[PDB]
Amino acid sequence: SPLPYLRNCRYDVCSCSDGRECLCGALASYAAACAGRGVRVAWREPGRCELNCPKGQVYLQCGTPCNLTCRSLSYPDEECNE
Amino acid sequence: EYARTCAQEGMVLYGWTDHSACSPVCPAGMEYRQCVSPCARTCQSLHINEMCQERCVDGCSCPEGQLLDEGLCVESTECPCVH
Amino acid sequence: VCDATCSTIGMAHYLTFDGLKYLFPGECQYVLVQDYCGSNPGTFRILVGNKGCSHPSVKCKKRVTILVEGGEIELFDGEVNVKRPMKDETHFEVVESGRYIILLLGKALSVVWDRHLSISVVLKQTYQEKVCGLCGNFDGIQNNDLTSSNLQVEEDPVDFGNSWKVSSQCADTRKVPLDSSPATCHNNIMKQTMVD
Amino acid sequence: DQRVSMPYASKGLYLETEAGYYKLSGEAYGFVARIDGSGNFQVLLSDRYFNKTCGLCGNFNIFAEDDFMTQEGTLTSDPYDF
Ligand SMILES: *[C@@H]1O[C@H](CO)[C@@H](O)[C@H](O)[C@H]1NC(C)=O
Ligand SMILES: [Ca+2]
Ligand SMILES: [Ca+2]
């Protein structure tokens, strides 16, 4: 139920110094809470802080941290259930 | 109409439609029961007697089994859960 | 372990036995609290019926019917009617005081009514996880109070409320959007600050 | 002006399918209307409206001979004028 997260977002936006970051970190907290129940939400847009991570990167939604880095190649037998 | 008004006068006449050869139209599955209980038996219903004892009214209901589920008679075994 | 009281705060808010407040604007008749719960024998089946109060307004009639040990009492328009009489009339005692009617329905079950809209059923430790309805099971644990009639916990009060609807052919309450200013404070910020 | 679902419960009117027939009850106002499958209408007015009702069903007085009162307040004998 998104009521507590609503109260949290209003408080964060009014009180903190930079309302942009606080809003985009409160929506993200709610989205993480929802995705902890199986429901993935696509809330990022050009008006809602879509992550601009470095040039050699790209934004995803259901990533695979099993093989993202390449220490995993150095330790292949190592479990990656994630 | 002659039945219904006669029913409203306090003496409901039973089984006049056996050989009338005309029957009221009703949704598929249900038959025109003369003096059916207004208190249905929907699958998701709390079993609260003595609180659903209104006056009987003529109308059509499911067969002897086949509890209601959103206006569609289904056998009592297949009552769907809701969440 | 002390006593415990439900409460129908206002016109669409409920306060369960374990101190959980929630919002459920019904229109039909619901099971406020009952003892015919699970494999228990059970004795009483208090019911509350709303009329014209999905939107809390100045019509908002309510009527409670108590089906305790046979005969059933009912409270309406600031009056108590004993439609059918309790078989152990030694227990029944409708004491009236102040602006309230206090009904003593036995030893552990009592009811307090303020003649208009506030209704509060009071239990002693006799029941202690033997009841259910719109007031939860009264077991000290506040998390599991929204167990619907299907013995499952619902995350939304309206679902858990419609689960207790007595007549399964009347209207389910709609999932109203979540906003602070319900109806008339919607765009009247002046009135919003006034009521605040 | 807008199509609504069914059952409906606003404003003290309860509109629901009972016994397969659409029903519109207003017991606060003391009336119950009903429509069956073929399209017949049926209105069950209360008793508080005795000698008070005034419509196409005639006034609700026990007499059955003066039931053609027009809106002008004058009894007629041709059903179409009434
Ligand atoms: C009904 O009201 C009319 C007009 O006032 C009166 O003439 C008549 O006697 C009344 N009938 C009954 C049954 O009260
Ligand atoms: Ca509980
Ligand atoms: Ca007449």
From Swiss-Prot, chain B:
Transmembrane spans: none
Annotated effect of mutating R4W: In VWD1 and VWD3; defect in secretion and formation of multimers
Highest taxon in the source lineage: Eukaryota
Ranges for domain TIL: 26-79
Protein name, UniProt field: von Willebrand antigen 2
The organism of origin for this protein: Homo sapiens
Classification of source organism: Eukaryota, Metazoa, Chordata, Craniata, Vertebrata
Gene: VWF
Swiss-Prot record, chain D:
Organism: Homo sapiens
Residues listed as glycosylation sites in the UniProt record: N51
Protein name: von Willebrand antigen 2
Lineage of the organism: Eukaryota, Metazoa, Chordata, Craniata, Vertebrata
Domain of life (superkingdom): Eukaryota
